[PDB]
Coordinates of C-alpha atoms in Angstrom, one line a residue:
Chain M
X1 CA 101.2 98.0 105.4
X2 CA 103.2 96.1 103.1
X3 CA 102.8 98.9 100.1
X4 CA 103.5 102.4 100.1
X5 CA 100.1 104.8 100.8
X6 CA 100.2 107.8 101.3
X7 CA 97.0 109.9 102.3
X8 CA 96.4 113.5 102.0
X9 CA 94.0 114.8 104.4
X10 CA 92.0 118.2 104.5
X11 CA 91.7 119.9 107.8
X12 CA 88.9 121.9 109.0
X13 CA 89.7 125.8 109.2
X14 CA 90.6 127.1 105.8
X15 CA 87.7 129.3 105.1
X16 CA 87.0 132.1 102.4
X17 CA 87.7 135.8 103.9
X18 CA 90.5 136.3 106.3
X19 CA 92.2 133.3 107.7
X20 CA 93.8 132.8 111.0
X21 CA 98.1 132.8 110.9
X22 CA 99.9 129.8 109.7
X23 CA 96.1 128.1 109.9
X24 CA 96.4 124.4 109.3
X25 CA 94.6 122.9 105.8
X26 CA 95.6 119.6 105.6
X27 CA 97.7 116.8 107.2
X28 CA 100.0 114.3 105.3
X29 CA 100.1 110.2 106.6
X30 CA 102.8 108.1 105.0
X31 CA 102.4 104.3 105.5
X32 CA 104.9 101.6 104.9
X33 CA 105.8 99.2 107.2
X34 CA 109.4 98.6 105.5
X35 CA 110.0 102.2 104.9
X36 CA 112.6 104.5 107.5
X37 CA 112.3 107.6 105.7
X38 CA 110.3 109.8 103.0
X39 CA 110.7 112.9 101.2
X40 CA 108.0 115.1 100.5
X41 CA 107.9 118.1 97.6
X42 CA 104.5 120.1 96.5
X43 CA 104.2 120.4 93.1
X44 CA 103.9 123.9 91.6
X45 CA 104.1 126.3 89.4
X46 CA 106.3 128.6 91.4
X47 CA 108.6 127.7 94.5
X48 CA 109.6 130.0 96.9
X49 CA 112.7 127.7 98.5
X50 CA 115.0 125.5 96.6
X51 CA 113.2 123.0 99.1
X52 CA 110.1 123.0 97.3
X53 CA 108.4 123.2 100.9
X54 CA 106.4 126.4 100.4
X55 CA 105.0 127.2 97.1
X56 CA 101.9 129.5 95.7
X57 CA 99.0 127.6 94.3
X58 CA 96.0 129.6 92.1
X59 CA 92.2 129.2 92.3
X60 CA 90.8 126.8 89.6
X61 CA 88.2 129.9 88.8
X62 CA 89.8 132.9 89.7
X63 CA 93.1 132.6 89.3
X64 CA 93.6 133.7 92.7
X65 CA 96.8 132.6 94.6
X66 CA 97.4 131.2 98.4
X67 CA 100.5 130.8 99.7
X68 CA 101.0 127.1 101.4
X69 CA 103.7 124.6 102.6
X70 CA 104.6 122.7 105.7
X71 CA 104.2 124.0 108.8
X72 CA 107.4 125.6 110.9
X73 CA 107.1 122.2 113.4
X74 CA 106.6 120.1 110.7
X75 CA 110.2 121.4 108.8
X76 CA 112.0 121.5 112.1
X77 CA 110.9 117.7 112.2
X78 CA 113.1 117.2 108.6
X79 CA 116.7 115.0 109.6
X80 CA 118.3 116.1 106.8
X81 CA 117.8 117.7 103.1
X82 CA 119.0 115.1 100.2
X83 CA 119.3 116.1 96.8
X84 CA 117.8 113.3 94.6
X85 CA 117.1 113.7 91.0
X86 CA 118.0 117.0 90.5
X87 CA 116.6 118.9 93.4
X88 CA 116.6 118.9 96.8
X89 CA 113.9 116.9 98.8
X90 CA 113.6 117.2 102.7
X91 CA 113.6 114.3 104.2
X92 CA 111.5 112.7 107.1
X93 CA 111.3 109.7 109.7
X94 CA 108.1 107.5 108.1
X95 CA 106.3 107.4 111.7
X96 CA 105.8 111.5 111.5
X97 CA 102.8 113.0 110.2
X98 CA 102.8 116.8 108.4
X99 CA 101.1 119.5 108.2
X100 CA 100.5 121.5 105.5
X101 CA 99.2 126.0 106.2
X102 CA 98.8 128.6 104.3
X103 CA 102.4 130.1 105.2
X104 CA 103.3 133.4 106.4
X105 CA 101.3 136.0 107.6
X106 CA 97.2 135.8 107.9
X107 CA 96.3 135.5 104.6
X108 CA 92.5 136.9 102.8
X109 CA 91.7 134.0 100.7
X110 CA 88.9 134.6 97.9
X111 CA 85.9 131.8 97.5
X112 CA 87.8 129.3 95.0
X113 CA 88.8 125.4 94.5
X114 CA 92.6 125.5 95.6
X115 CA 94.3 122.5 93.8
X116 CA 97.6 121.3 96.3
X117 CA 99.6 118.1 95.0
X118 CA 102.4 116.7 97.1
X119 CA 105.0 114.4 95.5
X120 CA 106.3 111.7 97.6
X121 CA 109.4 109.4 97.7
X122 CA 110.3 106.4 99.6
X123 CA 113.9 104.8 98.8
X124 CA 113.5 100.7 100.4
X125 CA 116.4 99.7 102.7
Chain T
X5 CA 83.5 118.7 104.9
X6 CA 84.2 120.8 101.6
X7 CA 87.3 118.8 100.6
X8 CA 88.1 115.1 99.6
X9 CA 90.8 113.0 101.3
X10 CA 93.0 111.7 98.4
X11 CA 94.9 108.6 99.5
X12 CA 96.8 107.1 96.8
X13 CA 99.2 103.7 96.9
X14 CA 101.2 101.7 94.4
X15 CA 102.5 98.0 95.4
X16 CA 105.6 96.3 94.1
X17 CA 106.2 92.8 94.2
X18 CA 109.5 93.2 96.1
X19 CA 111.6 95.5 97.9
X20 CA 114.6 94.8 95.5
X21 CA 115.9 93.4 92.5
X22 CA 119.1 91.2 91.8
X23 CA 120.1 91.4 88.5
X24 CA 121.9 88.9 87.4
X25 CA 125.0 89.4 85.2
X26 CA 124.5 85.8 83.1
X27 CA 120.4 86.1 83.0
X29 CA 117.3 90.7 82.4
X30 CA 114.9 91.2 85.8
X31 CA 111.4 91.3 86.7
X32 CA 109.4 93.4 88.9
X33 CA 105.4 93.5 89.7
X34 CA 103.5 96.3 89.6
X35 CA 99.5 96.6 91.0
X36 CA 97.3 99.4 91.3
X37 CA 95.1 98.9 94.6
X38 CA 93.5 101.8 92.6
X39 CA 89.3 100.9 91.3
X40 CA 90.6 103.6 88.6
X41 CA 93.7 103.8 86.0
X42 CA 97.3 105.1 86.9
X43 CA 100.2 106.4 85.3
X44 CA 103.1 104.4 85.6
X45 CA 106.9 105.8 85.1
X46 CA 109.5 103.5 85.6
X47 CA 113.5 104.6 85.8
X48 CA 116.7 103.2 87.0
X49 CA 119.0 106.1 88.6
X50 CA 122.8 105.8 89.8
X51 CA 123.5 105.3 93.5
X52 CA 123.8 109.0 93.6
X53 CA 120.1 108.8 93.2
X54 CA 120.8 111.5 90.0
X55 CA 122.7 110.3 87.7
X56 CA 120.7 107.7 85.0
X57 CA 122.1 104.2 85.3
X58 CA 122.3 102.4 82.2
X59 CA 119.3 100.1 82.5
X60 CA 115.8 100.7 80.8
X61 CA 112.6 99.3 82.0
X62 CA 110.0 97.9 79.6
X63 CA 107.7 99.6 79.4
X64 CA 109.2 102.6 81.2
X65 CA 105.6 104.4 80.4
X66 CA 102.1 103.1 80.7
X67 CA 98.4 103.5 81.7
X68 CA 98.0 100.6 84.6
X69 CA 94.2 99.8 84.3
X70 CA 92.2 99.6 87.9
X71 CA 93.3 97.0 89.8
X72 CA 95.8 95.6 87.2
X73 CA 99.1 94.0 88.3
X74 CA 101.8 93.8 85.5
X75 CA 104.8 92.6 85.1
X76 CA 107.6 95.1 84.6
X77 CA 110.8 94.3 82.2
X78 CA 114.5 95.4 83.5
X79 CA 117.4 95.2 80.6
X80 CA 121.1 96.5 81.7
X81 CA 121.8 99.0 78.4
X82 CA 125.4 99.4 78.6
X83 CA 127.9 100.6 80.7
X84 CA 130.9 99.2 82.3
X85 CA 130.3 96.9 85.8
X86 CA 132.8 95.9 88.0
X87 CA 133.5 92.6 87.5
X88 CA 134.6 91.6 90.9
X89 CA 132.2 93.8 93.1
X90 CA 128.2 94.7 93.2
X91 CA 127.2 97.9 91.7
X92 CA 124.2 99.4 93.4
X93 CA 121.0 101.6 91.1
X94 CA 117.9 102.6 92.1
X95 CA 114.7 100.9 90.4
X96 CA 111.6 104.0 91.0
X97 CA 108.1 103.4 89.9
X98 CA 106.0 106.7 89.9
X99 CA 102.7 106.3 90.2
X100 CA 100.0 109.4 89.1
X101 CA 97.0 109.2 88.9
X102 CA 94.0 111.0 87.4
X103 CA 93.0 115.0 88.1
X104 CA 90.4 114.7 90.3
X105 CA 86.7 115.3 89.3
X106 CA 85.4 118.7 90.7
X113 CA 83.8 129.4 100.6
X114 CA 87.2 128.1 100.0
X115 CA 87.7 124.4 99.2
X116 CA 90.9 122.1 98.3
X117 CA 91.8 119.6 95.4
X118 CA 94.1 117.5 97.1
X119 CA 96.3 114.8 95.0
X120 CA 99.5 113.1 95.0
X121 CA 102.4 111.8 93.1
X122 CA 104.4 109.1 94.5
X123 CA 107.2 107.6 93.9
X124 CA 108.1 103.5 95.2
X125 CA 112.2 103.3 94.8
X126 CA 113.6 99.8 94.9
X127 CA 117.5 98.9 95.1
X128 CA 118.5 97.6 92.0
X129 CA 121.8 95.7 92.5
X130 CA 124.1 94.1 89.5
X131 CA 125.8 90.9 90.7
X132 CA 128.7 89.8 88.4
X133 CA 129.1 86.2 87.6
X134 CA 132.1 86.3 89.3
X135 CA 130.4 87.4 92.5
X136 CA 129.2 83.9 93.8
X137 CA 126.4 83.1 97.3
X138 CA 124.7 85.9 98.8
X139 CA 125.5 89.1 101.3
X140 CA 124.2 86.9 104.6
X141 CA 126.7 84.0 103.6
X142 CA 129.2 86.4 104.5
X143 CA 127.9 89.1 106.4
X144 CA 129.2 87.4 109.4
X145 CA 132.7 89.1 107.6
X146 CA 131.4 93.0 108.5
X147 CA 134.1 94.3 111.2
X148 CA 133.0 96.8 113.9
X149 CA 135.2 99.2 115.1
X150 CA 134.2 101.9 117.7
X151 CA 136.1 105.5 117.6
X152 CA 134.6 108.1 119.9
X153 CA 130.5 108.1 119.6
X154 CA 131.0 106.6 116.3
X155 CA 130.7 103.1 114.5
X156 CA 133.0 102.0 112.0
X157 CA 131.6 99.2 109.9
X158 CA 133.9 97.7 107.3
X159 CA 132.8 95.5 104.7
X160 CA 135.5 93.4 103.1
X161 CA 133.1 91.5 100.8
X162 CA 132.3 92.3 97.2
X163 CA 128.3 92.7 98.3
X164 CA 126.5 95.9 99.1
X165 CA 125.6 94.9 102.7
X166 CA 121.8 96.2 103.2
X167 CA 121.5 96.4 107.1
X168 CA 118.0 96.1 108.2
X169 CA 118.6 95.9 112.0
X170 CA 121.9 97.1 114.3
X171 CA 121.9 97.4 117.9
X172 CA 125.0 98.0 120.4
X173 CA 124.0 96.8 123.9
X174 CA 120.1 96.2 122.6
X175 CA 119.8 99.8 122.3
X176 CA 118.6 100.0 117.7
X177 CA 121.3 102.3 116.0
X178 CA 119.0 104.1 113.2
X179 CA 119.9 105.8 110.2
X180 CA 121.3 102.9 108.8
X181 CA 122.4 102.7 105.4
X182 CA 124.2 100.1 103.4
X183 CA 127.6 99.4 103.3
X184 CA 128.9 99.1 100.0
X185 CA 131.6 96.4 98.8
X186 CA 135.3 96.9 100.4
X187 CA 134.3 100.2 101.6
X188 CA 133.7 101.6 105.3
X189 CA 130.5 103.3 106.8
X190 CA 130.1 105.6 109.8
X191 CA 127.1 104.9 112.0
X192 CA 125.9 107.0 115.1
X193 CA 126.5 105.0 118.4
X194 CA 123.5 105.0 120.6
X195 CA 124.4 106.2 123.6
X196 CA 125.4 102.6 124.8
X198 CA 128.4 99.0 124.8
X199 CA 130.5 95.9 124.3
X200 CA 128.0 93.3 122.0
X201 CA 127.1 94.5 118.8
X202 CA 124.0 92.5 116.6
X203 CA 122.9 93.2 113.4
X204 CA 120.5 91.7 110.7
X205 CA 120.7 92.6 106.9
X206 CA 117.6 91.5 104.6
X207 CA 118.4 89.1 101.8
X208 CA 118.2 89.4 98.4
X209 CA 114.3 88.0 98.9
X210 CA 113.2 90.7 101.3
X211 CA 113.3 89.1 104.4
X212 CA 115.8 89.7 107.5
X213 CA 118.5 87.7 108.2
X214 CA 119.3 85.8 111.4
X215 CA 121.1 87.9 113.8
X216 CA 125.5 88.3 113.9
X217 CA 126.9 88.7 116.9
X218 CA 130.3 90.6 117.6
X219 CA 132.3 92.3 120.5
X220 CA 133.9 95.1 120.3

């Protein structure tokens, strides 16, 4: 508890083919036991808010692109938006989990390896 | 199941540094890791933008599996209050490796461990909780004044009106004011901060 671990977690549902709307892929845990608040950015190659909450990520074989970012309850969970180190980071209470989709409407998603990395800040009171 | 959990952590050997005006500080770094990290370190302003003038040596390294190392902080340049603290942000990034590889997922993370890095002048003599008895509370409308008339940043880690917790704390800088969101309360007001060695204070007790 003492250090700062974050997990990323795959959830069961993404599938090859046409996906169900906003479907769920993975869930983000933060742990600290000194920590109040994160912030939380995927890093990408493209961004589709200054947010960087929703971005496009492409196929390690393909080249094929999915569209992911947190989920419309997850954002609504954000206190405020902070702009630290040049961009602006969502924030979030420490005790709330998130959850990554693929964003928007159903998406057809070809047979690939999808490579999603989240960047993660905690400031110590 | 297709995909790997990553879970990825980075431990510090405190949850601040003091830097000393007359002393250069220290700060642990370990990788809980069985593999090798990449280790960033940086000082930014209070704005948590601007770059502060301090350096950490190294400020770029491979941390093997399991290694704990000792990080160097060196104050560059410019020009610190003499009578006041001056508040900067100490942040380790941690990254580690790609990862070795229907539609699956290569989940991996960046993160980033941000300690308060806080210049005391000479000049500047005791602690914050030898004189955080001194923090004034004044209540207008559903919010909490809290004035600070000491030259510490005063780093709050507990405030409760009535026993009901305020959150969203944040420091309160030297001779300045903060505004805190009441909690729905009143009358006794309580707070803790935590001391320059990571722990909480005893409580203070005021009335408003």
């Amino acid at each position: 508890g003492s250090d700062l671990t974050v997990s990323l977690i795959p959830v069961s549902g993404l599938k090859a083919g046409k996906n169900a709307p906003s479907a769920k892929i993975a869930k983000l845990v933060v742990n600290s036991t000194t920590l109040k608040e994160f912030g939380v950015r995927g890093i990408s190659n493209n961004v589709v808010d200054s947010t960087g909450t929703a971005w496009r990520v492409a196929g390690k074989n393909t080249g094929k692109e999915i569209g992911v970012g947190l989920s419309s309850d997850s954002l609504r969970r954000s206190d405020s938006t902070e702009k630290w180190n040049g961009v602006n980071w969502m924030t979030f209470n420490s005790n709330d989990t998130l959850d990554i989709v693929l964003t928007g409407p159903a998406q057809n998603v070809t047979a690939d390896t999808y490579p999603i990395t989240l960047d993660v800040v905690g400031y110590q009171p | 199941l297709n995909s790997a959990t990553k879970l990825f952590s980075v431990k510090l050997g405190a949850t601040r540094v003091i830097y000393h005006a007359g002393t250069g500080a220290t700060l642990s770094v370990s990788n809980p890791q069985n593999y090798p990290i990449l280790v960033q370190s940086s000082v930014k302003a209070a704005d948590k933008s601007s770059p502060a003038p301090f350096l950490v040596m190294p400020p770029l390294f491979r941390l093997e599996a399991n290694q704990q190392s000792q990080l160097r902080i060196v104050r560059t340049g410019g020009d610190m209050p003499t009578d006041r603290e001056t508040l900067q942000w100490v942040c380790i990034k941690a990254v580690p490796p790609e990862n070795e590889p229907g539609a699956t997922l290569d989940l991996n993370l960046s993160i980033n461990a941000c300690d308060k890095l806080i210049f005391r002048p000479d000049a500047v003599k005791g602690t914050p909780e030898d004189v955080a008895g001194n923090l004034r509370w004044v209540e207008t409308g559903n919010k909490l004044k809290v004035e600070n008339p000491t030259p510490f940043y005063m780093n709050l880690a507990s405030v409760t009106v009535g026993g009901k917790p305020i959150t969203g704390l944040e420091y309160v800088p030297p001779f300045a004011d903060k505004t805190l969101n009441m909690p729905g309360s009143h009358g006794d007001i309580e707070w803790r901060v935590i001391t320059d060695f990571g722990g909480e204070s005893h409580p203070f007790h005021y009335v408003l």
